[PDB]
Design an enzyme around this catalytic site. Structure first.
Site, PDB file in Angstrom:
ATOM      1  N   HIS A   1      10.458  -8.922   4.476  1.00  0.00           N
ATOM      2  CA  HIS A   1      10.160  -7.489   4.359  1.00  0.00           C
ATOM      3  C   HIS A   1      11.072  -6.679   5.271  1.00  0.00           C
ATOM      4  O   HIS A   1      11.377  -7.113   6.377  1.00  0.00           O
ATOM      5  CB  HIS A   1       8.658  -7.275   4.669  1.00  0.00           C
TER       6      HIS A   1
ATOM      7  N   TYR B  16       1.747   4.823   1.769  1.00  0.00           N
ATOM      8  CA  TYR B  16       1.642   5.376   3.141  1.00  0.00           C
ATOM      9  C   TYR B  16       0.317   6.135   3.251  1.00  0.00           C
ATOM     10  O   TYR B  16      -0.154   6.750   2.282  1.00  0.00           O
ATOM     11  CB  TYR B  16       2.805   6.334   3.398  1.00  0.00           C
TER      12      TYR B  16
ATOM     13  N   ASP C 121       0.813  -1.221   0.000  1.00  0.00           N
ATOM     14  CA  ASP C 121       0.000   0.000   0.000  1.00  0.00           C
ATOM     15  C   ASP C 121       0.841   1.264   0.000  1.00  0.00           C
ATOM     16  O   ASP C 121       1.953   1.272   0.559  1.00  0.00           O
ATOM     17  CB  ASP C 121      -0.808   0.108   1.348  1.00  0.00           C
TER      18      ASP C 121
ATOM     19  N   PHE D  45       7.938   2.727  -0.825  1.00  0.00           N
ATOM     20  CA  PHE D  45       8.984   3.011   0.157  1.00  0.00           C
ATOM     21  C   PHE D  45       9.275   4.472   0.433  1.00  0.00           C
ATOM     22  O   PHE D  45       9.477   4.868   1.582  1.00  0.00           O
ATOM     23  CB  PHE D  45      10.295   2.199  -0.076  1.00  0.00           C
TER      24      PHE D  45
END
EC number: 3.2.2.27
Lengths: 4, 223, 4
Positions: free
Chosen positions: B185, B64, B62, B75
């Site tokens: 992750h 932020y 997703d 990111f």
């Protein structure tokens, strides 16, 4: 806003 | 390649699942739901990294979901925003592995994208504060098609697949034609299970140099 | 469950  | 997204997504733009997704997001914005990133930014990964220029693909899930944070890249955050904890862990791995990398004072990664790093979230919009709130739309269908088109129309792309979701998303990729690297992750929830030590940034550059191409300079630059 |  769509680059294609 | 000289290939562009326009060359391979022009018909995809006309598909019902895609049109329904855009119309739903637009209707929500109109009704007063705050959705991130802003409409002008939703496709910035594609704007900054053309299909023929893709060297490395790094998947997220997703955007932020807080004000001023997301801007259409996995990111990355806008200049001035505190570094997200997953990106901080990426910076720690980078500082431990890339000669002369030092902790950046921001989290803005456009300069990665301009070097050929496609920072692709699999879902491209989110309602404010609410993770997975747009997962039920057609974005995963769209980003499945994007990954399939890179697989089909390019050779030798490095895919960095971090976490279970990204690894499943990349299960299709031809592992002889492309270079697929997997790790946990970088989130604090999982980084100590093997993200630290994965050495993916160096490995991606070693691949690029073995291909006769220029490596990525992983130090991000403010505009 | 890791959105980001």
């Amino acid at each position: 806003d769509i680059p294609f | 390649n000289e290939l562009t997204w326009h060359d391979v997504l022009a018909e995809e733009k006309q598909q019902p699942y895609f049109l329904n997704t855009l119309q739903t997001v637009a209707s929500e914005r109109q009704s007063g739901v705050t959705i991130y990133p802003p409409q002008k930014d939703v496709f910035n990964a594609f704007r900054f990294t053309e299909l023929g220029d893709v060297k490395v693909v790094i998947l997220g899930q997703d955007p932020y979901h807080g004000p001023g944070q997301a801007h259409g890249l996995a990111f990355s955050v806008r200049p001035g925003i505190a570094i997200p904890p997953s990106l901080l862990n990426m910076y720690k791995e980078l500082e431990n592995t890339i000669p002369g990398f030092t902790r950046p004072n921001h989290g803005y990664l456009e300069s990665w994208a301009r070097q050929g790093v496609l920072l692709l979230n699999t879902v491209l919009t989110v309602r404010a504060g609410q993770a997975h709130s747009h997962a039920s739309l057609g974005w995963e269908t769209f980003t499945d098609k994007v990954i399939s088109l890179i697989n089909q129309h390019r050779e030798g792309v490095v895919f960095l697949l971090w976490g279970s979701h990204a690894q499943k998303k990349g299960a299709i990729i031809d592992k002889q034609r492309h270079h697929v690297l997997k790790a946990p992750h970088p989130s604090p929830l999982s980084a100590h299970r093997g993200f630290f030590g994965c050495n993916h940034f160096v490995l991606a550059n070693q691949w690029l140099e073995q291909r006769g191409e220029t490596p990525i300079d992983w130090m991000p630059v403010l505009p």
